[PDB]
């Protein structure tokens, strides 16, 4: 029964069978109950604060060739850009001036900055009294060590898919084993460590999604970023189907149920495939929002997938936009850095 699966989730009997059935049931009443459960767990464990992470996508140069990603190296159609270190620091300062308590630096895997330019930038942003999150992809342990020494607080490295065969096919420069070793290294170095997957990748099954949930639970990640796969026309996956919003939303809800004290963003991809998708996701277990703080003329060139929200908006629009969002949702903006606040339990 849908009823029995909810009871088992409520009782924290997180068996593969329970998770598979939750993901497989396509009953509206069940889905709405699951979303309510996640929303309640979110409210109880992490409260009504929605944490704002200002993201600066500072370079779209990439050395890797992931089949799903518009920044893949084989995409010749794309104008490549790099913000200067001074531009990045001053852009971060403007976000802090707008009230951002976390700055997220994200890029393609761009060799130019690695590792010392990143270290310099992180040190300057840390002087501003905010959290710094890096999302720069896979690099040697030494680089991650230098960045932690420089003051970085968190690292987002989505695991993408926990199916090693699918992972290797979609990410031909690397492997799930590498990705996992990176994530374990980040944990060992003391970063708040973020993982998470895409939903609806070509060839990905419900069993794969269950494996993603069990992977996340196993490693007790501090942040989990989940979103639908969105096909990009200048990639080998151009003609594949987009991920299903409702299924992806169920993954978010189950992640909250499994990791009740984690930080879980309402990802931009959720807002891209369905108008108002981020707001929905914030009401089904998410507690974090990541407004775009990349300046023009670069914002429109960071084309991981098409249709990406925020691209046509003014340079400073997105922090005010999410503050309005937070208020109309009956929520509150985060007061502190929004680090993970563990609730130890049984």
Ligand X SMILES: C[S@@+](CC[C@H](N)C(=O)[O-])C[C@H]1O[C@@H](n2cnc3c(N)ncnc32)[C@H](O)[C@@H]1O
Ligand Y SMILES: C[C@H](CCC(=O)NCCC[N+](C)(C)C[C@H](O)CS(=O)(=O)O)[C@H]1CC[C@H]2[C@@H]3[C@H](O)C[C@@H]4C[C@H](O)CC[C@]4(C)[C@H]3C[C@H](O)[C@]12C
For residues 283 and 312, give the distance between their C-alpha atoms in angstroms, rounded to a whole number: 26
Shortest separation between residue 25's beta carbon and ligand FES, angstroms? 31
Q: Which two tokens stand for residue 180?
A: 């996992």
According to the binding rule CB under 6 A, does residue 322 interact with ligand [S]?
yes
Subset of residues 81 to 140 that bind ligand SF4, contact rule: CB under 6 A: 108-109, 137
- Examine residue 291 and tell whether it contacts ligand FES (CB under 6 A): yes
Residue 310 near ligand [S] by CB under 6 A: yes
Nearer to ligand X, 109 or 212 (CB): 109
Q: Does the annotation place 182 within a ligand binding site? A: no
Residue 72 in contact with ligand SF4, rule: CB under 6 A: yes
Q: Which of 213, 150, 229, 222 is nearest to 183 (CA)?
A: 222
Interhelix angle 116-126/141-149, nearest 10 degrees: 20
Q: Which is nearer to ligand Y, 214 or 323 (CB)?
A: 323
Tokens of 149: 């020494």
Stretch that binds ligand X, among 9-17, 90-98, 156-164, 284-292 (CB under 6 A): 156-164
Q: Which does 72 bind (CB under 5 to 8 A by kind): ligand SF4, ligand Y, ligand X, none?
A: ligand SF4
Burial level of 254, CB count in 10 A (0-12/13-18/19+)? buried
- CA dist 337 → 128, 132, 283, 334, 340 (Å): 12, 9, 21, 7, 9
Residues in the chain: 346
Can residue 335 be called a binding residue for ligand Y (CB under 6 A)?
no
Pairing mode, strands 288-289 and 102-107? unpaired
Q: What is the C-alpha to C-alpha distance for residues 270 and 284, in angstroms, rounded to an integer?
A: 12
Distance of CA 107 to the CA centre of its chain: 13
Among 64, 168, 219, 242, binds ligand SF4 (CB under 6 A): 64
Residues that bind ligand [S] in the complex, under the rule CB under 6 A: 292, 310, 313, 317-318, 321-322, 325
* Binding-site ranges for ligand SF4 (CB under 6 A): 62, 64, 66, 69, 71-72, 108-109, 137
The binding site for ligand X (CB under 6 A) comprises 68-69, 71, 106, 108-109, 135, 137, 157-158, 160, 198, 227, 229-230, 232, 269, 304-305
């Amino acid at each position: 029964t849908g009823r029995e699966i909810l009871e088992k989730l409520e009782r924290r009997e997180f068996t593969r069978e329970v998770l598979k059935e939750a993901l497989s049931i396509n009953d509206r009443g069940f889905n709405e109950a699951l979303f309510k459960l996640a929303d309640e767990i979110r409210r109880k464990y992490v409260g009504d604060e929605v944490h704002i992470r200002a993201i600066i996508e500072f370079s779209n140069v990439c050395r890797k060739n992931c089949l799903y990603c518009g920044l893949r190296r084989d995409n010749k159609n794309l104008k490549r850009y790099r913000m200067t270190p001074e531009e990045i620091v001053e852009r971060a300062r403007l976000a802090v001036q707008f009230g951002a308590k976390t700055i997220v630096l994200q890029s393609g895997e761009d060799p130019y900055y690695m590792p010392d330019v990143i270290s310099d930038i992180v040190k300057e942003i840390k002087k501003m009294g905010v959290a710094v999150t890096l999302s720069l992809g896979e690099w040697p342990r030494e680089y991650y060590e230098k960045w932690k020494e420089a003051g970085a607080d968190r690292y987002l490295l989505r695991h993408e898919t926990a199916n090693p065969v699918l992972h290797r096919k979609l990410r031909p420069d690397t492997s799930f084993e590498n990705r996992l070793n990176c994530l374990l290294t980040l944990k060992e170095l003391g970063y708040e460590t973020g993982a998470g997957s895409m939903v609806g990748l070509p060839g990905q099954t419900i069993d794969d999604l269950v494996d993603d949930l069990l992977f996340l639970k196993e490693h007790d990640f501090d942040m989990v970023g989940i979103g639908p796969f969105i096909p990009h026309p200048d990639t080998p996956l151009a003609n594949e189907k987009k991920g299903d919003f409702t299924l992806t939303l169920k993954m978010v809800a189950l992640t909250r149920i499994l990791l009740p004290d984690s930080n879980i963003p309402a990802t931009t991809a959720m807002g891209t495939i369905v108008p108002g998708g981020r707001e929905i996701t914030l009401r089904c277990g998410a507690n974090v929002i990541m407004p775009n703080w990349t300046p023009s003329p670069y914002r429109q060139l960071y084309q991981l997938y098409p249709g990406k929200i925020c691209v046509f908006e003014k340079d400073t629009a997105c922090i005010p936009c999410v503050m309005k969002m937070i208020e109309l949702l009956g929520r509150k903006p985060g007061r502190d850095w929004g680090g993970r606040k563990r609730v130890f339990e049984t």
